[PDB]
Amino acid sequence: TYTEDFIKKQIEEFNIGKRHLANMMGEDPETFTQEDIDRAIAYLFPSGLFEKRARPVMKHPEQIFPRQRAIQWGEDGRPFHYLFYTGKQSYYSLMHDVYGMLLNLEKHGSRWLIKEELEEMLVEKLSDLDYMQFIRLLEKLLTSQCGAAEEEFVQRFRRSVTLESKKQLIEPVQYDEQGMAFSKSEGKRKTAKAEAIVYKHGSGRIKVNGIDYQLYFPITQDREQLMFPFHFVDRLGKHDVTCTVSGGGRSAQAGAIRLAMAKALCSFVTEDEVEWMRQAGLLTTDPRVRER
Amino acid sequence: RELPCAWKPVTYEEAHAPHYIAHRKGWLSLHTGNLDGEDHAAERTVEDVFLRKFMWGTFPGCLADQLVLKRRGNQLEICAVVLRQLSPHKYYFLVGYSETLLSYFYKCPVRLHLQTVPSKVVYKYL
Amino acid sequence: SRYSPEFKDPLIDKEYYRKPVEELTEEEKYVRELKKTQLIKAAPAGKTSSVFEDPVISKFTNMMMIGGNKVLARSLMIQTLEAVKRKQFEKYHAASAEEQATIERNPYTIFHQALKNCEPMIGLVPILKGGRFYQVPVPLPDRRRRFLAMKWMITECRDKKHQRTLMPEKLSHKLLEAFHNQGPVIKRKHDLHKMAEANRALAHYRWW
RNA sequence: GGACCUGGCGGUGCUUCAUAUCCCUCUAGAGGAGCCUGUUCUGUAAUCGAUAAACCCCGAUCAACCUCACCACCUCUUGCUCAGCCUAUAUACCGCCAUCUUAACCCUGAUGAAGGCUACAAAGUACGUUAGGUCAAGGUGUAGCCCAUGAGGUGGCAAGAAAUGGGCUACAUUUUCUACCCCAGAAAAUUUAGCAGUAAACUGAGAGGCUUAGUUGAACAGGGCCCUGAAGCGCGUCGUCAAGUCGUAAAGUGUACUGGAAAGUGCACUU
Ligand SMILES: [Mg+2]
Ligand SMILES: [Mg+2]
Ligand SMILES: [Mg+2]
Ligand SMILES: [Mg+2]
Ligand SMILES: [Mg+2]
């Protein structure tokens, strides 16, 4: 057990050590920070142990010792909080606030906070049923016409998960010296890497490493693979393609070129067509590779 | 006792198992022999064995924990952790004696770095 | 699998996406909106949006494959189709005016009908109990019977009694035989239908 | 003698589902021929046994007149060098692999044995082990024989037969050879995986049967369990001759008659 005097001595020791470390590293003690402490301790006491916690560390004592033992009453013995005798003053105070806001509203993507992190915020252990109670109250608050204050209150208890599918980065439309518009893109399949330039206007000529596509790809399967992107969006014979492919084999190179042409052609089609190509599997890098 | 009736302080090195040697523990000896391309790893191992036995027999009941044997160039540093039970005069005597024996036995400048502690620094209880 | 469970199979149909928003049901509309969120797998080498694509012929080619040699399997398939086309043109040019209206020259129609004529309706499944495997008649699923027609055709064409007759010519002849309800594959279908009627004692076990 | 309580069955079955491994189905390949090994029988005095120890100088290989090993006869002796043997022992240790084991507090029952849950909440809170393998990429010892467990010489030994287990080669027309790297011309039953860049086919790099880098690229993808998981119901609460030195896993209560009585029927009652 750590007495408050012990923690006080630890704080003053840590401050003296902070100024000492600033002295050793030549930095200004006034602006010396915790990240600087971490970097300096890493330099002066190098350690390659895989366990991140096992390395030498200099933390502020409150970070090290468990300081959740906050006193809930003063010298006279009167508890500070009017819900102290419930034993769950934080949780029930929060429930009281939520109920009051629901009363006020009655008179007038993202995920819910988990149980353990809710305990961490409240600094109080709570069961599952009371967590469910709180979440149902939060749902009720959301369904009602919650205002800006209520919206941010809910956001205090709503964690963030990012969803960013549907959005294919559309490469910029560049212009060559002759004034013609084109777009460049890259693709990869197994060890084959392709880089294609699709022109806005053309007559359907594909040129692979400076060779016509039927001469570079004798097999019909690869020519069908090259045809698939333009055929899908009904623009066969309307663009010129100049691509450079390297590595891999016959089918891997054909697949890399197909991916590159689809990603470059996304510049000259409508957003609905881009989404359709995405759903047809034409804009996804195939990750299947030889396993050791 | 009875057959179904069946059905110790430890320091950090004692507590943690061998599969933590590069995760939580470290290496007691530090030298270049085991690196790729370097030679004489076995000779360093034999030297380490002799150092450990010699030190454990020359400081009996004093070493609180295991030695740390560092090597830089031809230097040989023994960083030991001992107890505050033996008198400092005897510690100085033994430091001088051990330094000179090991320097003349290994033909290198050996040096020794006692760190006394009041008692064994127990990590946990197993 | 290198794909996460999140990734979904792609839909290569080209006329599905052009379906006007008006014809969309609320359910189909919801599915269309849901696919917007999902991750989709890269389309595999093989099926494309081409109008000459035929999944049945692709599966037949894959079933003739040996050692990953797809070029050779497709070469054999196209040689077989060409041979069927040429034989039907030969028969059509030598036929009377009234026999020409009933000579099929499309090799794809012939291939599909020949495989359809070889599909069995009933098969046998062994079941284990008592140490004795029991052979119960079973109505075959559509996938199983479509697979069995192809497997029987390919095994019939791989028979070693056909010495130095090249696979395209054997396969075209077998396909044209099956198109007319003749040949050994139709007989193999009949000998399973008879060996499933010979064992109607256990005909009602519905839990194979 | 009356009332009450704890229980315990190292218990017994079933029910439903999660039921993944494991199934079963389903998919794709794996039997003939020639040699080499395992076991058995038969046979010999005997070993169709081995080459840091022959041969060969494409690979491998059989017996080789090599040599060791075996069988039948002999010889040598202080000799090699205070000689000589790879003969034993890790059933000596070390090393290297592997096996197995690893309390308090608060309430209720009148302060009895005793009991304490309801969430729209009603008292509950806190290392050893091993007759182990390895004496080929390694050691430290200990024992053995020393007219022989050493050194030689003369002959022989060189097996036979089945049924099955395993291994190595070739096994083609979707093939083979050339040019090319794919539009040419000439020739002729168990078992192993499955679950995808996987199976199958084909190339390169290494340390010198094992480690890494590539190319092409499939088929099938349905029903139920063992077993833990999730719970629920029920049941169940042995006998005997002298104790084991014994054996074994609609229903009732009365009464009357009963001569086809392992209990039945008749009459009256109870739930
Ligand atoms: Mg022999
Ligand atoms: Mg010898
Ligand atoms: Mg042993
Ligand atoms: Mg009677
Ligand atoms: Mg009676």
Side-chain angles (χ1 to χ4, degrees):
Chain A
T1 318
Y2 305 125
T3 56
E4 188 57 47
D5 173 60
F6 182 76
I7 301 297
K8 191 175 183 181
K9 290 163 170 176
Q10 294 297 109
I11 300 299
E12 61 86 20
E13 283 189 352
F14 172 87
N15 317 324
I16 292 158
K18 185 195 289 290
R19 291 188 296 272
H20 286 169
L21 186 56
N23 186 0
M24 306 175 199
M25 302 297 288
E27 294 199 56
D28 181 16
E30 183 178 1
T31 70
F32 190 68
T33 78
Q34 185 61 59
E35 300 172 9
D36 300 350
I37 289 164
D38 296 331
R39 186 186 64 256
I41 292 286
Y43 169 63
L44 296 168
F45 306 98
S47 184
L49 298 169
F50 303 125
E51 283 288 355
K52 299 293 183 182
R53 284 161 285 193
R55 281 75 178 273
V57 71
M58 183 177 176
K59 289 187 178 73
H60 194 232
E62 63 93 14
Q63 296 294 321
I64 299 153
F65 308 117
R67 294 297 89 198
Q68 67 274 14
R69 183 70 276 171
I71 54 152
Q72 302 182 108
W73 55 82
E75 71 280 17
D76 52 9
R78 294 182 63 82
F80 298 124
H81 209 287
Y82 76 105
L83 295 176
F84 164 86
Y85 287 102
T86 69
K88 284 147 58 158
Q89 59 182 63
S90 313
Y91 169 73
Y92 284 124
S93 180
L94 193 64
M95 295 269 285
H96 176 91
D97 295 341
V98 172
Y99 191 89
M101 293 182 286
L102 284 157
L103 282 166
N104 189 359
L105 282 71
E106 286 155 26
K107 289 155 206 165
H108 180 303
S110 48
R111 63 187 262 272
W112 274 130
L113 183 62
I114 74 184
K115 183 183 165 289
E116 297 183 313
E117 184 178 1
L118 178 69
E119 293 179 353
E120 189 274 330
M121 180 161 28
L122 294 173
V123 190
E124 313 203 299
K125 277 75 71 177
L126 56 91
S127 71
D128 59 355
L129 289 164
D130 63 10
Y131 169 59
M132 183 177 176
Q133 281 286 345
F134 176 59
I135 293 292
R136 297 193 262 161
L137 280 186
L138 276 170
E139 297 279 300
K140 289 177 70 66
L141 197 80
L142 272 167
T143 60
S144 60
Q145 191 174 348
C146 72
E150 293 83 3
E151 280 171 352
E152 56 80 16
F153 180 95
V154 176
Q155 291 295 320
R156 294 182 67 248
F157 306 91
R158 203 143 174 63
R159 292 288 181 272
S160 65
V161 299
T162 195
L163 195 150
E164 59 90 24
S165 296
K166 154 184 295 309
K167 300 301 290 184
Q168 187 66 70
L169 276 52
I170 306 296
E171 298 255 5
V173 167
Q174 300 165 87
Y175 289 84
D176 61 335
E177 290 308 338
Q178 292 56 13
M180 281 303 117
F182 75 97
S183 58
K184 194 185 299 189
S185 179
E186 69 275 16
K188 192 154 173 35
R189 179 84 188 88
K190 296 189 173 180
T191 53
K193 316 206 280 203
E195 195 173 6
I197 289 155
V198 175
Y199 285 95
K200 202 160 87 68
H201 305 286
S203 180
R205 319 200 49 192
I206 301 164
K207 190 66 66 67
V208 189
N209 295 351
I211 301 150
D212 291 331
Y213 68 98
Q214 85 282 0
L215 305 171
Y216 192 84
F217 286 118
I219 303 300
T220 317
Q221 187 178 12
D222 309 312
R223 291 200 298 277
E224 294 175 354
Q225 287 294 285
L226 301 194
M227 182 179 72
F228 183 16
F230 296 98
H231 185 256
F232 183 81
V233 290
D234 287 302
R235 67 180 64 252
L236 283 171
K238 293 171 76 175
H239 295 259
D240 284 332
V241 179
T242 306
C243 63
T244 48
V245 69
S246 61
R250 195 200 76 259
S251 44
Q253 284 186 336
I257 293 162
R258 187 193 80 180
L259 185 59
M261 294 183 287
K263 285 200 251 164
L265 194 62
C266 275
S267 298
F268 309 118
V269 298
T270 69
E271 65 183 1
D272 291 331
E273 284 168 49
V274 174
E275 175 56 25
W276 303 349
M277 281 187 267
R278 202 187 68 81
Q279 292 179 17
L282 281 160
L283 307 170
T284 311
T285 309
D286 193 303
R288 301 177 296 154
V289 296
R290 173 54 58 83
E291 312 278 356
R292 81 292 183 276
Chain B
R1 298 285 75 78
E2 185 65 35
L3 273 73
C5 182
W7 320 103
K8 176 254 283 174
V10 310
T11 61
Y12 191 92
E13 292 290 296
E14 271 171 43
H16 282 95
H19 63 278
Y20 294 125
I21 276 165
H23 308 263
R24 310 182 176 178
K25 303 156 70 176
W27 292 276
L28 297 165
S29 175
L30 292 172
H31 60 91
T32 63
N34 284 273
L35 294 164
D36 195 72
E38 308 314 295
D39 300 340
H40 318 313
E43 274 316 330
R44 298 307 94 77
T45 304
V46 170
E47 288 188 41
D48 271 15
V49 164
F50 176 86
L51 294 174
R52 285 173 197 288
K53 272 73 181 173
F54 173 83
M55 285 270 99
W56 273 89
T58 293
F59 288 85
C62 307
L63 304 175
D65 196 309
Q66 293 179 356
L67 308 171
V68 186
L69 306 175
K70 296 176 184 293
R71 288 196 178 85
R72 290 198 304 282
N74 58 2
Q75 293 179 358
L76 173 49
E77 295 199 341
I78 301 95
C79 304
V81 185
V82 306
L83 296 155
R84 282 180 204 163
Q85 184 177 2
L86 204 56
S87 67
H89 306 95
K90 204 39 163 53
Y91 271 128
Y92 272 98
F93 179 87
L94 293 169
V95 161
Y97 166 85
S98 69
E99 278 182 355
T100 299
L101 276 296
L102 294 164
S103 300
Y104 282 67
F105 183 75
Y106 287 160
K107 324 306 199 165
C108 75
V110 188
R111 185 179 67 189
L112 188 153
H113 284 297
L114 295 187
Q115 185 197 134
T116 62
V117 308
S119 62
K120 279 83 171 182
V121 190
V122 302
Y123 175 41
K124 75 183 281 192
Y125 284 72
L126 280 167
Chain C
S1 178
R2 179 65 179 86
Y3 280 110
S4 311
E6 304 176 4
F7 279 85
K8 309 302 184 187
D9 264 10
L11 185 64
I12 313 305
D13 186 74
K14 179 177 171 182
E15 190 276 331
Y16 173 90
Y17 298 104
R18 274 69 172 174
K19 299 298 293 295
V21 65
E22 299 176 352
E23 291 187 8
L24 299 185
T25 62
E26 291 186 347
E27 307 181 354
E28 180 63 25
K29 192 169 187 178
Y30 166 83
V31 175
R32 299 269 262 271
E33 294 294 328
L34 175 59
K35 293 209 81 190
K36 301 295 187 291
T37 299
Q38 298 160 352
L39 292 161
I40 313 296
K41 299 185 181 198
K47 168 155 217 182
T48 57
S49 49
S50 190
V51 304
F52 305 120
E53 189 68 42
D54 194 359
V56 183
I57 285 177
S58 303
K59 210 70 173 177
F60 199 93
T61 303
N62 286 347
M63 284 174 69
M64 278 184 315
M65 185 180 288
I66 295 166
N69 199 5
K70 206 165 212 169
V71 175
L72 178 60
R74 174 142 187 77
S75 174
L76 294 170
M77 188 65 208
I78 63 178
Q79 287 178 46
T80 299
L81 292 175
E82 182 193 356
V84 170
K85 204 177 182 180
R86 290 190 189 287
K87 287 178 186 186
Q88 289 306 82
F89 269 70
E90 261 167 42
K91 292 173 70 175
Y92 181 101
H93 187 273
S96 172
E98 301 179 356
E99 292 181 356
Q100 281 179 353
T102 59
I103 289 171
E104 181 66 78
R105 290 182 297 181
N106 191 357
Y108 299 97
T109 294
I110 296 168
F111 183 85
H112 290 291
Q113 189 62 28
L115 285 186
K116 187 269 183 182
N117 294 134
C118 298
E119 302 186 4
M121 293 177 70
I122 296 92
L124 307 181
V125 160
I127 296 170
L128 178 52
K129 181 169 178 288
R132 296 190 295 269
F133 293 78
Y134 302 127
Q135 310 313 302
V136 301
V138 63
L140 295 173
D142 189 358
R143 312 178 311 277
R144 185 57 181 160
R145 63 182 293 165
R146 263 193 290 141
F147 175 92
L148 285 177
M150 286 156 154
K151 182 68 177 176
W152 292 345
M153 190 67 67
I154 299 167
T155 298
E156 179 58 39
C157 293
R158 286 173 178 181
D159 201 274
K160 287 291 144 283
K161 292 177 71 68
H162 308 112
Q163 183 62 255
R164 285 178 64 184
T165 310
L166 303 172
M167 179 85 193
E169 195 279 331
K170 303 183 287 193
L171 189 56
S172 68
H173 179 71
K174 296 288 102 175
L175 286 171
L176 285 169
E177 273 184 338
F179 188 58
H180 296 114
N181 286 301
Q182 293 179 356
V185 186
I186 303 291
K187 179 165 162 287
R188 185 163 181 171
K189 182 188 78 173
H190 290 324
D191 306 332
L192 185 71
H193 289 179
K194 182 174 72 68
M195 173 180 120
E197 293 179 353
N199 190 357
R200 299 291 180 90
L202 283 47
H204 208 55
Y205 203 88
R206 293 144 274 163
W207 316 278
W208 51 90

